[PDB]
Amino acid sequence: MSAIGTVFKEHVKNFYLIQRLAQFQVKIINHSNYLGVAWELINPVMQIMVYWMVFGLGIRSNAPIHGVPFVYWLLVGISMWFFINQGILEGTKAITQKFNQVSKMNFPLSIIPTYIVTSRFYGHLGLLLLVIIACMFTGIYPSIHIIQLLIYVPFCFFLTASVTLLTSTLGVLVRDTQMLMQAILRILFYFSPILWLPKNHGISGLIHEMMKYNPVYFIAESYRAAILYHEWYFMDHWKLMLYNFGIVAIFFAIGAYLHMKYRDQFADFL
Amino acid sequence: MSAIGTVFKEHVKNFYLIQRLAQFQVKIINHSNYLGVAWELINPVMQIMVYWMVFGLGIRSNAPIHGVPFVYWLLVGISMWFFINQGILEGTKAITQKFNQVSKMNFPLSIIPTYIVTSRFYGHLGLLLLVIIACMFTGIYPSIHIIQLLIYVPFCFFLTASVTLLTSTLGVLVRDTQMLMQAILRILFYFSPILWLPKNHGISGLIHEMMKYNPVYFIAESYRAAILYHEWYFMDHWKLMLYNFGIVAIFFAIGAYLHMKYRDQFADFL
Amino acid sequence: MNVSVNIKNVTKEYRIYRTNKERMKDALIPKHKNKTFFALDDISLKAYEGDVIGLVGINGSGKSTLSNIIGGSLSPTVGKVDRNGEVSVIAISAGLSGQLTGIENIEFKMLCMGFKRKEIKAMTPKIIEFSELGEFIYQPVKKYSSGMRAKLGFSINITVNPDILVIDEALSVGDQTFAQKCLDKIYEFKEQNKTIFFVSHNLGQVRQFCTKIAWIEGGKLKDYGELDDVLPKYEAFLNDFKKKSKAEQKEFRNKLDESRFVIK
Amino acid sequence: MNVSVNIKNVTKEYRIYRTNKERMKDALIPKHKNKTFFALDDISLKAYEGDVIGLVGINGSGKSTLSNIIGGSLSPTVGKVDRNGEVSVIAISAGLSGQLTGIENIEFKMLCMGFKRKEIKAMTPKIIEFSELGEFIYQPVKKYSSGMRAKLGFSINITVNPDILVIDEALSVGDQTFAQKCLDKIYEFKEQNKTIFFVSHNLGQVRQFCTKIAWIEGGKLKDYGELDDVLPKYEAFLNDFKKKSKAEQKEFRNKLDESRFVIK
Ligand SMILES: CCCCCCCCCCC(CCCCCCCCCC)(CO[C@@H]1O[C@H](CO)[C@@H](O[C@H]2O[C@H](CO)[C@@H](O)[C@H](O)[C@H]2O)[C@H](O)[C@H]1O)CO[C@@H]1O[C@H](CO)[C@@H](O[C@H]2O[C@H](CO)[C@@H](O)[C@H](O)[C@H]2O)[C@H](O)[C@H]1O
Ligand SMILES: CCCCCCCCCCC(CCCCCCCCCC)(CO[C@@H]1O[C@H](CO)[C@@H](O[C@H]2O[C@H](CO)[C@@H](O)[C@H](O)[C@H]2O)[C@H](O)[C@H]1O)CO[C@@H]1O[C@H](CO)[C@@H](O[C@H]2O[C@H](CO)[C@@H](O)[C@H](O)[C@H]2O)[C@H](O)[C@H]1O
Ligand SMILES: CCCCCCCCCCC(CCCCCCCCCC)(CO[C@@H]1O[C@H](CO)[C@@H](O[C@H]2O[C@H](CO)[C@@H](O)[C@H](O)[C@H]2O)[C@H](O)[C@H]1O)CO[C@@H]1O[C@H](CO)[C@@H](O[C@H]2O[C@H](CO)[C@@H](O)[C@H](O)[C@H]2O)[C@H](O)[C@H]1O
Ligand SMILES: Nc1ncnc2c1ncn2[C@@H]1O[C@H](COP(=O)(O)OP(=O)(O)OP(O)(O)=S)[C@@H](O)[C@H]1O
Ligand SMILES: Nc1ncnc2c1ncn2[C@@H]1O[C@H](COP(=O)(O)OP(=O)(O)OP(O)(O)=S)[C@@H](O)[C@H]1O
Ligand SMILES: [Mg+2]
Ligand SMILES: [Mg+2]
């Protein structure tokens, strides 16, 4: 219970520090590019074009889903994926390559994976703004239901930050854990509603029912209901939202306890 | 023409150097793992299980293909993928992070992406041996047609090495090029016969005809004909093999010219 | 008269492995016996306010381990360190990024040392003036020379105001025209009565700077006391070592390393 | 009497950018005018066999640029370097990996310097004996101390046999008990009549080691000649610089940097 308060207080008095270090990390990883920090926008867009060419034309021949054309349906669903994948991949190893540069300084050590996640959250916010503007060009305009993004986008950030806070400590203690994340993230990607809906294709009693336990299913569905379908998603899916909040709380609790136990000994595992 | 002979001679008097530096690179990237260098085997196997759970059970309900069960069909087809993806990804940036440690030594600079590729080729060879042993357990035994692997596995290595030799020089001159490879490799992955065959699903006149221009289609099909189907693949697909050899020769020619032109100036672009 | 740093029975032990099989048995078996190396072995010394303490000894003695334990980066296996006051370490390169420009590195390193936004905006220009980089402060750090990078790192690192200061291997930095400013800044740190720990092999700077000597030999505190009492004995050991044969020096190194290794 | 290194009109120019927009215009426009920095400006000196040449100068003068141009790592923008003989550079850390053990680093670094398998297997044990690491030669290099890593890197680097040798900032390495062996090895390199280029700020080692001095000031060869002719004038410049005011030193630095920057 002291671990929760410690990690929470180190996150709340260092909000500007997290934002500025995330901006510096964005400038660091894009320094030698001619296009600069625009690649954080360009590379997900190219991957989106690849995924629409494969899973839209090759699988269902660009058929509409729920009265929405497939390109915008996929565009709202895949918007948070690149952030989730990149934040979980890069911030699992964040303390592994960033502890030694702040070890001799009095630094809040629990915010290192958080700013590594925020460096991808910037590109997520830019991509989401472009996705909303691109959805404006068809006839899907923002209704009153779009203020649910003020709940859903911070939820995606907090899920990524809690998972990253657990997996960064586990990666320092066992390096093998970072190798596990490649298979884990493909499990989270393909077993989700982002590229397909298993209602008009195959079995719903096993494939679609087990997809609800993925937090990705809630995040993609919630953004689609906020942006595309113009419905309040929490009227019919409040139990799923409660389960997702419990998942976030459990990940944050276990991650905050493990970090407080091993933070003094991190030089030993590195 | 002097560039071709120069790169070829630097590759043929440094074969032991390439092998030993590749072994050292394998030991370097797996040093802190408890399981050691076994992760080069374990992580593709876990990804194989994910891809069979998704594209085998979810898409076609583990239906057999060409008289072969889907798990072994996918197992022979996906064996070279992880090597191709990892070698093209890591060796595009090989001169970017490895030039400065050999810049002041008299070193053959064209073999750096080659040993970075060979470090993944070791795990490819181990995975292919396990795939053949796993295919033995059903009733598919090695016939006389398996000596085509002595042509096809070096072809996969040489394709990866030629593409890597071009893309390493382009990455030093323009860093943006390394950002392009993420979308390019997904294009090469999904538009191929590794996870599906577009004959029993959809259009063959456009999707399946354009898949022949992928070198991946030849490599997966050739391994399957050598290992599973027990046929000589070059009787019916000699034109495709000639096209693939021409692709390898063109990639090697353009990569060897660009490397010879900019190798003295690499410190300038780094 | 008031104790600033109190080190009581500090021991640092490292498990030593040759294969991955040994590492895995030690991790998985609750009573596995393995080779253990004593980087430090029962160190007990206390520092007062205004003490400038020089850590001397041969390579691999354990003075960087003791300095990192004092600075808080490294945890003791056994014993406790009690510090009254803040601790700062002068290591010039820890926050420096080649990709960032010199102006960007000053803010990033200063944020990582814990300075606030108004403080960084206040003391950026005298850091720029002290570094004397000129037009290259808007250029990336990977385009610098080694002396320019060292000057920028020292200019950022010298702006701390701790109670306990730890300096490793460098009182000064740069060429001959820059070293006197570094000496003046370090002597200004000495003038405000701060506990300074100095780790170096340069015995001239140690003699002209420090007031107490902590001699570390083989993970143990060989001697601790005043500079004029302890430093001539370390110098006598140093001149006595070169007058031995190669077999005698190898015997001394083997006898030193025999006690530092133990199966437990 | 025979020329070993011949440097003729060597100039190194670097394009200087502040934004990515300037970098992109220079790349895409055939006659774009941009700020250019002269790291070196028309250097002409020739070295004979047996010459030990010290490269002196203030920070950012261009002596590492000239040493990398001589060593072959860096290409001149203009001019030519003609070398009769092989060139080796003593840089201790270039092949050292923390992940590799010291025994593994010796083979990896030696393979990267271009030694053959039989040569590496022949001279591994005297490298181990020279490094004096003991039991830590089977331990990973990231577990070393800084002096141990420096000793291992020097022990691997000292085994080259070139015609032209380039040494940067370190004749010796380690503590006081190890530096004499490094001095003996470097003096043995001097004894077999090799052209040695030495780049350092330590004027005592330069005076006791070198026979000729190349003074570099602001990217230009200020003076080149015998040690007793050129080194007292560089020392006189060094003592003259500290007796100026801060405004005079800033004026000298600005006048030095004014000629090195040009729009072209
Ligand atoms: C690089 C790009 C290349 C792409 C590579 C190609 C691979 C594409 C795979 C195609 C696929 C994947 C489904 C996706 C699953 C996603 C969940 C996974 C989640 C796991 C984590 C999509 O096929 C879909 O599934 C159904 C299959 O028909 C169909 O459903 C409909 O069924 C109702 C009647 O039962 C119907 O009344 C109602 O309208 C729908 O409900 C859908 O409309 C169809 O789009 C699987 O379907 C396979 O393909 C074909 C479809 O036609 C099908 O072949 C034939 O079908 C007809 C004769 O049978 C014939 O007429 C077709 O001409 C011929 O084709 C195969 O037999 C089938 O097995
Ligand atoms: C695929 C690969 C498979 C193989 C993987 C095998 C890896 C297992 C490693 C075990 C591990 C990882 C945590 C596990 C994950 C988190 C769990 C939850 C995850 C849920 C999502 C947990 O080790 C923890 O160590 C704690 C030490 O405080 C200990 O605390 C309590 O312990 C006792 C009461 O039990 C009690 O005496 C103690 O006082 C308590 O404090 C914990 O009980 C113990 O679990 C870390 O091991 C630790 O490593 C340390 C530094 O190397 C090492 O300390 C060093 O000390 C010297 C230097 O200073 C030097 O001598 C050595 O360098 C080393 O000895 C520890 O000794 C070692 O244990
Ligand atoms: C998404 C992002 C979009 C933006 C991307 C824009 C990037 C474009 C960059 C252009 C680029 C990349 C090659 C292109 C890719 C390969 C092509 C094939 C690919 C097929 C798969 C090609 O630049 C090449 O440079 C050669 C230089 O020898 C030149 O050769 C001939 O040139 C003339 C006759 O044309 C003739 O006078 C010359 O003598 C010939 O030798 C080539 O013609 C020219 O193409 C590299 O630019 C080069 O960068 C160099 C170091 O920074 C720079 O030298 C430096 O000199 C000083 C220091 O020493 C210093 O002053 C500066 O540091 C810099 O000046 C070069 O000047 C510059 O040109
Ligand atoms: N993580 C580690 N695991 C095992 N041994 C270590 C580790 N870190 C340091 N050592 C050993 O601890 C001993 C002393 O470490 P240091 O304090 O760095 O040496 P030192 O006294 O500073 O000597 P220098 O730096 O060469 S003057 C050396 O023998 C190191 O090899
Ligand atoms: N890639 C580069 N781009 C631009 N300027 C550079 C680059 N590399 C070096 N410089 C500049 O070139 C000048 C001289 O470089 P160096 O030779 O490294 O300096 P130096 O004479 O060795 O001085 P030291 O190392 O501090 S004693 C410095 O002003 C550097 O900032
Ligand atoms: Mg230098
Ligand atoms: Mg040290």
Author numbering:
A (entry chain C), B (entry chain A): 1 to 270
C (entry chain D), D (entry chain B): 1 to 264
Which sentences did the original study use to describe this structure?
The cryo-EM structure of S. aureus TarGH in complex with ATPγS was determined to 2.3 Å resolution. One of the highest resolution ABC transporters yet determined by cryo-EM, the quality of the reconstruction permitted confident modelling of the complete sequences of TarG and TarH. In this ATPγS-bound state, three well-ordered LMNG molecules are observed. Two are bound in symmetrically disposed wedge-shaped clefts formed at the inner leaflet/cytosol interface between the TarH GH, TarG IFc and the LG-loop on the opposing TarG protomer (denoted LMNGC). The third ordered LMNG is observed on the extracellular face of TarG, on the dimer rotation axis (LMNGE). The level of detail at 2.3 Å resolution allowed unambiguous modelling of key active site features that show it to be in a non-optimal configuration for ATP hydrolysis. The aliphatic side chain of Val173 is inserted into a hydrophobic pocket, which includes invariant aromatics Phe154 and Phe178, with its backbone carbonyl flipped away from the active site and no longer in position to coordinate the catalytic water during ATP hydrolysis (we designate this D-loopOFF). An additional consequence of this rearranged D-loopOFF is the creation of a solvent exposed cytoplasmic channel of ~10 Å across at its narrowest that runs through the NBD dimer, continuous with the electropositive intramembrane cavity between the two TarG protomers. We speculate therefore that the LMNGC-bound (D-loopOFF) structure represents a substrate loaded state with the cytoplasmically oriented lipid-linked polymer captured at the inner leaflet of the membrane but prior to polymer insertion and translocation.
